Amino acid sequence: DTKEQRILNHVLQHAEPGNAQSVLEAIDTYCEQKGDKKGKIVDAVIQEHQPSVLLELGAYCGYSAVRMARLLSPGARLITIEINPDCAAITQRMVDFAGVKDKVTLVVGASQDIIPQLKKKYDVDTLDMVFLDHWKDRYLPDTLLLEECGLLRKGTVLLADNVICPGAPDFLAHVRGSSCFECTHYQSFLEYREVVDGLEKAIYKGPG
Numbered sequence: 693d694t695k696e697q698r699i700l701n702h703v704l705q706h707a708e709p710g711n712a713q714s715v716l717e718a719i720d721t722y723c724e725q726k727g728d729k730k731g732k733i734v735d736a737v738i739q740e741h742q743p744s745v746l747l748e749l750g751a752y753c754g755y756s757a758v759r760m761a762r763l764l765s766p767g768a769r770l771i772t773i774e775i776n777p778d779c780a781a782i783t784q785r786m787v788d789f790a791g792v793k794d795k796v797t798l799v800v801g802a803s804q805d806i807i808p809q810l811k812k813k814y815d816v817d818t819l820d821m822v823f824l825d826h827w828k829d830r831y832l833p834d835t836l837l838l839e840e841c842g843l844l845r846k847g848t849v850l851l852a853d854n855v856i857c858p859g860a861p862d863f864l865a866h867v868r869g870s871s872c873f874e875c876t877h878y879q880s881f882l883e884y885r886e887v888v889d890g891l892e893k894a895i896y897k898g899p900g
C-alpha cells in the first residue's frame with residue numbers, strides 16, 4: 693500500500709545499503725516520527741531458539757523479513773509467504789537493499805495453498821519456527837494446517853503478532869487450551885507500519 697511504499701522510499705534515501713541494522717533503524721525512525729518493544733521480542737525469540745528453517749506468514753514492507761533474516765546463522769533459511777504481489781515486490785526490494793537476500797525465499801500466494809507444498813517443493817523437513825503476521829482469520833486454520841501437513845515437531849516455535857489488536861481470539865483459545873502447545877504472552881505496543889485508524893462523520897439527510 694501507499695504507506696509501505698513510503699517506508700521503502702525512506703529506507704532507500706536514508707539507510708546504508710547492505711546494512712540490515714541500518715534499514716531496521718530507519719524504519720523504526722520513520723514510524724516513530726509520524727510491555728516491551730516489538731522488534732526486541734522477535735529478536736529475543738530467534739536468538740533463544742536458533743531456527744535453521746523459519747517460515748514467515750505475511751510480509752508488508754519487508755521489515756519483519758529483514759529483522760528475522762539478519763539473525764539467522766549461515767545457510768539457515770527464511771521462507772516468506774505473502775499473498776499480495778505489491779507487498780511482496782516491496783519486501784524483496786527491502787530485503788535486497790538490507791543485504792540479506794541470500795537468506796530469504798519469498799513466495800507469492802495464499803498460505804493455505806503454499807503450506808502443503810513446503811515439503812515437496814521447498815525441501816522443508818519440519819519447520820523450526822513460524823512467524824504469523826498475516827490475515828488474522830488465517831492464524832488458526834494455518835496453524836491447524838501446519839500441524840496436519842506434518843511440518844511441526846516437538847519444539848517448533850509459533851510466534852504470532854497482533855493477537856490482541858486487531859486480535860486473533862480463536863487462535864489464542866486453541867493453542868492456549870490445547871495440551872499440544874506451551875504458550876507465553878508478551879505485552880507490546882502497536883506500531884505505525886502495522887495499522888492506521890480514522891473517524892467517520894456521517895450526517896443524516898433524512899428518510900428521503
Ligand SMILES: [Cl-]
Binds near residue numbers: 751752754755756
Ligand atoms: Cl513487514
Ligand SMILES: [Mg+2]
Binds near residue numbers: 886
Ligand atoms: Mg503485525
Ligand code: NA
Binds near residue numbers: 867871873
Ligand atoms: Na496450551
